[PDB]
Amino acid sequence: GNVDVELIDKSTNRYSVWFPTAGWYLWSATGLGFLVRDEVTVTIAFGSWSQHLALDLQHHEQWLVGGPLFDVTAEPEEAVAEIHLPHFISLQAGEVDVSWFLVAHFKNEGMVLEHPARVEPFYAVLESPSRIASGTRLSIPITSNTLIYYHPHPEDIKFHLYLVPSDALLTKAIDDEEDRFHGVRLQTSPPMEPLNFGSSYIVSNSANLKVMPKELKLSYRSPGEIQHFSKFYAGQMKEPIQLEITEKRHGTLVWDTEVKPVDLQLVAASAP
Amino acid sequence: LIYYHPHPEDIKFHLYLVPSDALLTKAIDDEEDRFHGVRLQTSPPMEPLNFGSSYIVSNSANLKVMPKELKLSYRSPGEIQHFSKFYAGQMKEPIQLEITEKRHGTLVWDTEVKPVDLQLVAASAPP
Amino acid sequence: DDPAARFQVQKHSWDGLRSIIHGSRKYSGLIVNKAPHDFQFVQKTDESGPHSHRLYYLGMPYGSRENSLLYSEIPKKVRKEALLLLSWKQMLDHFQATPHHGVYSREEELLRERKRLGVFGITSYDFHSESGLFLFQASNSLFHCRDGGKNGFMVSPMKPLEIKTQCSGPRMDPKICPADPAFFSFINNSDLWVANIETGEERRLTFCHQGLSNVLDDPKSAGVATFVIQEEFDRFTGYWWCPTASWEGSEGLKTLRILYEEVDESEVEVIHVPSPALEERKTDSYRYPRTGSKNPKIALKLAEFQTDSQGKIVSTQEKELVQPFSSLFPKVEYIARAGWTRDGKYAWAMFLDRPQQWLQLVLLPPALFIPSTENEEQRLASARAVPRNVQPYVVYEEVTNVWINVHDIFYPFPQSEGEDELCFLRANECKTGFCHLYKVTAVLKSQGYDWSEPFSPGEDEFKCPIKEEIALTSGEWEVLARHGSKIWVNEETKLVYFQGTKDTPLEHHLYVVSYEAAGEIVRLTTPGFSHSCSMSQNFDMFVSHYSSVSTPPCVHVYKLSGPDDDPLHKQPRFWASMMEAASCPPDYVPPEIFHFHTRSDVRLYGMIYKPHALQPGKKHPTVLFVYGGPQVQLVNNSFKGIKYLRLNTLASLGYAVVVIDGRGSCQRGLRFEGALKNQMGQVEIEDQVEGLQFVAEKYGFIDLSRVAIHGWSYGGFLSLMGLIHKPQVFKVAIAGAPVTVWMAYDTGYTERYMDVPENNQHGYEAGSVALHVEKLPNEPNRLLILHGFLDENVHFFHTNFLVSQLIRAGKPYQLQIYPNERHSIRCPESGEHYEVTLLHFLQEYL
Amino acid sequence: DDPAARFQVQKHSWDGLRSIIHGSRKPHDFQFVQKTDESGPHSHRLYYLGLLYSEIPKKVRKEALLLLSWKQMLITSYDFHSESGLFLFQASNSLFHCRDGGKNGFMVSPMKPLEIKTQCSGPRMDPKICPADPAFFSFINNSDLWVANIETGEERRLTFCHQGLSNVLDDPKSAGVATFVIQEEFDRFTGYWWCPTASWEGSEGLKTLRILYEEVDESEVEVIHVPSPALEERKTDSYRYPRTGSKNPKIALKLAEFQTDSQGKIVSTQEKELVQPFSSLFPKVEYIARAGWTRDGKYAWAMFLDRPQQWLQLVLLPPALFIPSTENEEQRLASARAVPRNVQPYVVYEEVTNVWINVHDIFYPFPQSEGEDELCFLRANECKTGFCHLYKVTAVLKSQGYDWSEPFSPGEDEFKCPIKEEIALTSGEWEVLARHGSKIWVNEETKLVYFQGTKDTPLEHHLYVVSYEAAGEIVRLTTPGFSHSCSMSQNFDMFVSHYSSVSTPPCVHVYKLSGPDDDPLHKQPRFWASMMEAASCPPDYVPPEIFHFHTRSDVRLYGMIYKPHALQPGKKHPTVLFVYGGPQVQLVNNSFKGIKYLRLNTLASLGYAVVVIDGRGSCQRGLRFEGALKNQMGQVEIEDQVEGLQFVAEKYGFIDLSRVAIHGWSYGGFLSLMGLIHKPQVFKVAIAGAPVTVWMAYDTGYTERYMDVPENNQHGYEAGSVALHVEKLPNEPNRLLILHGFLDENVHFFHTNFLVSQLIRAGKPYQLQIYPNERHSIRCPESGEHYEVTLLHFLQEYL
């Protein structure tokens, strides 16, 4: 079932988690499947990709990053047998190879890149770790960075201010701590988060998506783009104005380099 | 000449007679933003929300800020650099002087023919 | 000739062309990286720590814009199936190692033009192993730090200690004393100084320079390599520490020698070249030796000093050879190289003749240098005092009919087994035609010289007889010795690691051989790439910074591993990686290397860049890029995207780009290079034309009506030879920095290849393009001359005399100046202008 | 736009253009001397350069064009002494002399000139014969004043400030020469001036002979290296070039005297110096524009000038004001007591202005024999009314009485004389020619002063006469409709005039003033004989049409145009606006340009409209006209040129406004670059030859006169410094051709270099052409042929 957390330091976001015995033990609040064999006192933190790379591989466009970074330390020697580590990049047969996936490890050595054995549609596996900053995901595409094809999920906020709803459209890839602390950064314009998901189709990186509701209001910043950044940042949001207490809103995310769309969402103002 | 993830933010305050902004084009990291967001508050603005730059910017290159209309415009060449915590960043602190509604700003490079940021802000919800 | 079947390049606007060149360099912030170099492996010796070595090197991780000292941690055991890539930890505490706006002093800036240093920051550093001392040059000053000697191996970076001085001026060329690491030495205002780390005390050793006025009135320098040496003998040092310390046994005093080169450039022609500060409107004088004109008058000298146990330079002493240098070594014009044997017994020096057809290696034992004082009776006194047996030993004497190539490979062995019969590893290209290693044993038997009386040595005076001269390598390929290549000699396993072109001339590979018994040459590097390698001091692992034409350059660390009883076949296993292959961009189509044969049936290599989005049928216009001169091989299997990205930009606009390494290119043997001897400029262009004609026959997109020839330095000279003797072949000619009169170029280069000008005058005139302007085309707009105004190497006079003779013959030209650029266009803005000018000129007028 | 109502120039090959330029190219310094034989045929002999002579007859025949043959007597500048008849000139490596009709007779067959040997190592610069003693002459050798004697052959050094040790960077004091900035901005080519009369000390028999010279200490002046003509040796020459804002050479006036026995030997010698330092006696004095002596020899005059060049003053320096110069300070005090307390320098005249001083070499002193104070002279003064006008000035030489041993600081009006009168001999909206080696001729018997001026029109230089006693009326002597350069006899009975018009080539006619002697103003000039005639005007050459127009500010500017040959009305031809535009040069005047401006006719013969405009800021139209460029150099003139183009567009129907080239050398290139910056929509291309791209690099004398100082006028230095405005140059190519002579000492290669530097840094295209063997103007015919064919090609292809 659900497992508890102990917050040691909020600045570095460090969690102490108790593990009773053997089991699968998926924890979906970050996406860690800690396939364990005994009682494990595990420590997990949040890592930023900016400070751990060689500073050349963010801008190397044969070197796509996947997943978020974790500082996972646990008991070694088959106490934690398998790591099912959360990444985001999609799994179809064309233009994605299993061999292109890599799992890093950030020691005082530097980076240790090992291949994973199997690749799950949401997770990637690390086998028998021997350990800090271990939750890692890299990729070497033999072709360019712009064709590796996994889609963000939209995340929308309608907030009531001077009796006028300001909207907030966010199009970032699915990283749970990134999404959550993006909302915590968004707490300064205090948000309410309904449950609507734009996981219908796929889109690559370097993608210019235009946004439109089908009915037209004060439209701001239509040709947005698809990019990924650190844990603490500001992504390319959209901030239109509703100006009224109307109920119905239909947003649409559609490409520019080709005619096809990627997302059509229906949202009401029943809970502003 | 390594490219950086930009932080554009124009931090606003409704003062008693002349409201004041503060335009920042400053590259991201955690400690630099955490320095700036509390240490600008001694001459108090309040932190807004605006559009982070979609395209990627390079260092040692002067940028140009154009508002669509006139404002208090000194020190218009903007430069990007990475200091420590203690030193004051290369800032803009314009004053929009009144209670007018909307404001449009654009970032244009020196040697490019293309912009990098097209930001808009409204004073309809002033701090 | 169908005019609808000839590809017309899209006429871009100038601002469009700027947009294109900038878009060519928008990924150059990553790929142009200054990949790490100058490695120093250091052991840790714990048997309980994790790391086997610490690798020290220069590098730019692009956390800073400057080249700085860094280190890596080499582990004791890596995981299998793992590409481990090392973090580049910083040696220093993130300071600024460059002056404001990238400027330098006059001595610092002139050094980087000789070394072709386009990178800012710590470009050269010195290291002393067991003390762990790092002596380097930063913004305008000397700095130091230490890592794991008597101190430990730190994990955070520390700030480097400043070395303060009372001296006014830059402190050029620092070297740590190997025998005593507390002491070091540098050049200050063309005089040799010596200092100490802990106490801070300095001491001048030579007093030939005084800082009066310009170089026309204070002509004596010491411990420096002059222009032509730095320029033509890739030597940028003129002093060499003695690696061991002698003990005079007076009371406790520890002697420390330095060999230095005194140079009298009084009789050398002075030329004025404009200064970079154009506003101030002065020139700088340069002692630039023309061909025909006199070279500097050289001499070797020994500078000793002594030290207490506390480390203070109590005494000092200049010493000079017991006979004059010019008289002891007649017909010797140039000191190519010099140094010391490891034990300190002899100071070696490579001498050279003015035609440079006559090389000879000499050993100068420190007792051969008597003191120097003005009184001729004290001079006679110590001339009597020098032992009769002590002499200079000419160990090796290379004589050739074309020219000597300077190979820095000497390597002496210890002599403690029967203390004569010197054994060394000497490279000799003149013998078989190809640079090959040899083990040579010469016989140092004293003939007995009355050193007080002055005598004239004969033609074979100090020449030692050779016991044996085993050839460690043989074939139609060369061992890399020039251009900062070197050999690494493990004397424990009796192996010598060298670089060579055995597999193909297009690929530099690391080979190893046994020097005691050389039968089998074992390659250590992977084929399909060209490699710049560097071995460890304990010879258990090396680095290779390698690339091929397709892949961008990577830097991998290999580890020799295997049975110890057979070290020759020790298997290099990839241990860890430093730098990876950069992004090959989608607008960058990597070129294809080819070869072909001449009518004289000699194999020439060439490159071609394909026109992007090639359509079969269309005859594209062709830019024959060319250097063509010696010491440069354009065509090789290594990444061209770094330095020759512009050629791909032309290709991406639709130009066929052809590159031909005709006769006279390096790394193909002496007989191949020697086809330009006495007719420089006349055979290279013929090879380039034939290379064009081959590419025209092989590939179906070469428009012979639209051919551009283009090149810098020597190539622009060839571009002008192309437009002079091949006007129907070449439509236009973009000549960058051309050498238009060989009578004006300096001795070291020009005399080596053509002759002394009164000996050969017919070929100077024939291959001086400025004397053949009458043959340049009368119709306009075919010739674009590019030149950097501040060029001390190929002076603006060359372009000026060309433009002069074009005016006098009534011939048109276009011309472009780079007022702030010396020889290679270093400012990115200025390079962007250069390329947009090249694209515009071809777009409109080819 | 009409697609076929615009003339297209025939695109010629380069060799075609050479064929056109080659097919295009397929006397002065007059000295009258009388004979007075009373039986021969010729009254005088006219001596001139062409050295030659003519025979002027006593009476020519009517209705016969008399043309004198150019006979050989035996050289660009010579010196002459009338009575003994000495002709001293400089040959290739040596000095020469000859004589005509003194104690000897008038030669008819040619005689070889006697050679003067020397002990000097180096050339003998600046030869001048002593007026008091024709046996003696003087010259400069290795930047020091020497003196010699013809008959004995013996020479003698007079100054000892330059030792010739090395180049000029370590041995900077010179004597008897004019430095660079004086030579090129104050038009002085000598730095020593003989006293015209000899004083007698009366010890035994010694004949004293003074010389005024200018000492210069240019140690604190910037040294610049400029490439030597001999390019192979690859060395430069140092030049003490005073940069604008920086310090000028440190000047002083000094007397080098010597004495002579009757047999003619320099027995003694003596350097002499002022009782105070020069810098202290004359504070804020920067430049000696001109200097000399009064005709009797009593006082030595000098025109001083300040750093803004807005304060000129004439000063008289009596020889007793100069004590001998020695290092020992007690002998110095000794002769400070020895100088008379009464005698002191008299600042006779002082021009002060808000615009700038133009240096006028018109002073002329009168005899002071009536009441030996109160010097009366004829001084040109432009600052009063705005136009250069002659004046008679009578000052008051009253001694204040100075203790010259004790030092002091003079006040701003300390040595200034009070003036008796300042009659203006001319007045109007025109000026008297004073600069550029023009001069006045003063008949002191008939009380008349003959000058040149522009009273009819600025386009025509005419000889005028007025009385200096009664300024009644100005009488013209030259034929109208032409412009004349004239030269009088010393006996004032006949003159030469070298004259021309816009249509006719140069002619040289000799006129003779003739009439009743009682009324000297109204002598009628009658044509006596002609020396050189108007040559064959070629049918390839159509002379330009002069026009004038008014600005929107209602200022009249003049201009020329060369029409395209074989004009078809309707067709709009491309137009080359040739320009200089800057001061001291008036391009448009009624005079033949075919010698220097043949290229403009070649352009016309290809079909280009050639326009030439004298905007406001040009010379020979007064100070207010010239002064529109004060502190705004580059900002007003191009506007005047644009307005002139646009006016000519309405008048003449053959200017295509889309196809406009601006082209000029020196300033004509600085403006071409200003044209391309501030009027890019007007000017399509710009052929800028030798342009001044940065005024902060130019010399003091020019730049400071107009833009006064960079620390003061920084806004205007940046605004009119064209090299700092390269961002406004066109991004598109083929619009800008920069030409520059590599050896240029005047507008240095730094200017073109800094322009090319800033073009590269701003990412802007340019074409460029070098002249490796040419200093400022294109002198070599091969280089001029290349220059013109490059100009024709550039216009053919890119205009």
Swiss-Prot record, chain B:
What's the impact of mutating residue 86 to G?
Does not affect autocatalytic cleavage; does not affect interaction with DPP9; impaired interaction with the C-terminal fragment of CARD8 in the ternary complex
Q: Where is this region: UPA?
A: 1-127
- Report the subcellular localization: Inflammasome
Domain of life of the native organism = Eukaryota
What is the recorded phenotype of mutating residue 49 to G?
Does not affect autocatalytic cleavage; does not affect interaction with DPP9; impaired interaction with the C-terminal fragment of CARD8 in the ternary complex
Q: How does it assemble?
A: Interacts with the N-terminal part of CARD8 (Caspase recruitment domain-containing protein 8, N-terminus) in absence of pathogens and other damage-associated signals. Homomultimer; forms the CARD8 inflammasome polymeric complex, a filament composed of homopolymers of this form in response to pathogens and other damage-associated signals. The CARD8 inflammasome polymeric complex directly recruits pro-caspase-1 (proCASP1) independently of PYCARD/ASC. Interacts (via CARD domain) with CASP1 (via CARD domain); leading to CASP1 activation.
Q: What does this protein do?
A: Constitutes the active part of the CARD8 inflammasome. In absence of pathogens and other damage-associated signals, interacts with the N-terminal part of CARD8 (Caspase recruitment domain-containing protein 8, N-terminus), preventing activation of the CARD8 inflammasome.
The entry's free-text remark on domains says:
The C-terminal part of CARD8 oligomerizes to form the core of the CARD8 inflammasome filament: in the filament, the CARD domains form a central helical filaments that are promoted by oligomerized, but flexibly linked, UPA regions surrounding the filaments. The UPA region reduces the threshold needed for filament formation and signaling. Directly recruits and polymerizes with the CARD domain of caspase-1 (CASP1) through the favorable side of the growing filament seed.
Write down the species.
Answer: Homo sapiens (Human)
> Which gene does this sequence derive from?
CARD8
UniProtKB/Swiss-Prot annotation, chain C:
Q: Which UniProt keywords apply?
A: Acetylation, Aminopeptidase, Cytoplasm, Disease variant, Hydrolase, Nucleus, Protease, Serine protease
List GO BP terms, alphabetically. negative regulation of programmed cell death; proteolysis; pyroptotic inflammatory response
Activity across pH: Optimum pH is 7.5-8.5. Little activity below pH 6.5.
Which molecular function term from Gene Ontology is one that the record holds? dipeptidyl-peptidase activity
Q: What are its E.C. numbers?
A: 3.4.14.5
Q: Which residues form the active site?
A: 713 (charge relay system), 791 (charge relay system), 823 (charge relay system)
Q: Is the keyword Cytoplasm in the record?
A: yes
Question: Result of mutating residue 85 to E?
Answer: Reduced interaction with NLRP1 without affecting the peptidase activity
Task: Look up the domain of life of the source.
Answer: Eukaryota
User: How is this protein's activity kept under control?
Assistant: Inhibited by the serine proteinase inhibitor 4-(2-aminoethyl)benzenesulphonyl fluoride (AEBSF), and by di-isopropylfluorophosphate. Inhibited by Val-boroPro (Talabostat, PT-100), a non-selective inhibitor, which triggers pyroptosis in monocytes and macrophages. Val-boroPro inhibits activity by binding to the active site, mimicking a substrate-bound state, thereby displacing the C-terminal fragment of NLRP1, leading to activation of the NLRP1 inflammasome.
Residues annotated as binding Val-boroPro: 713
Asked if Ribonucleoprotein is a keyword of the record, the answer is: no
Q: Which disease is it linked to?
A: Hatipoglu immunodeficiency syndrome: An autosomal recessive immunologic disorder manifesting in infancy or early childhood, and characterized by failure to thrive, short stature, skin pigmentation abnormalities, pancytopenia, and susceptibility to recurrent infections.
Protein function: Dipeptidyl peptidase that cleaves off N-terminal dipeptides from proteins having a Pro or Ala residue at position 2. Acts as a key inhibitor of caspase-1-dependent monocyte and macrophage pyroptosis in resting cells by preventing activation of NLRP1 and CARD8. Sequesters the cleaved C-terminal part of NLRP1 and CARD8, which respectively constitute the active part of the NLRP1 and CARD8 inflammasomes, in a ternary complex, thereby preventing their oligomerization and activation.
Swiss-Prot record, chain D:
Any one GO molecular-function label of the UniProt entry: serine-type peptidase activity
One biological-process term from Gene Ontology?
Answer: proteolysis
Q: Which residues bind Val-boroPro?
A: 666
Reactions listed under catalytic activity: Release of an N-terminal dipeptide, Xaa-Yaa-|-Zaa-, from a polypeptide, preferentially when Yaa is Pro, provided Zaa is neither Pro nor hydroxyproline
Enzyme class of the recorded protein, top EC level: hydrolase
* The organism of origin for this protein: Homo sapiens
Tell me what disease the record lists for it.
Hatipoglu immunodeficiency syndrome: An autosomal recessive immunologic disorder manifesting in infancy or early childhood, and characterized by failure to thrive, short stature, skin pigmentation abnormalities, pancytopenia, and susceptibility to recurrent infections.
Self-association state and partner proteins as the record states:
Homodimer. Forms a ternary complex with NLRP1, composed of a DPP9 homodimer, one full-length NLRP1 protein, and one cleaved C-terminus of NLRP1 (NACHT, LRR and PYD domains-containing protein 1, C-terminus). Forms a ternary complex with CARD8, composed of a DPP9 homodimer, one full-length NLRP1 protein, and one cleaved C-terminus of CARD8 (Caspase recruitment domain-containing protein 8, C-terminus). In the ternary complex, only one subunit of the DPP9 homodimer is bound to NLRP1 or CARD8.
- Which tissues and organs express this gene's product? Ubiquitously expressed, with highest levels in liver, heart and muscle, and lowest levels in brain.
Name of this chain's protein: Dipeptidyl peptidase 9
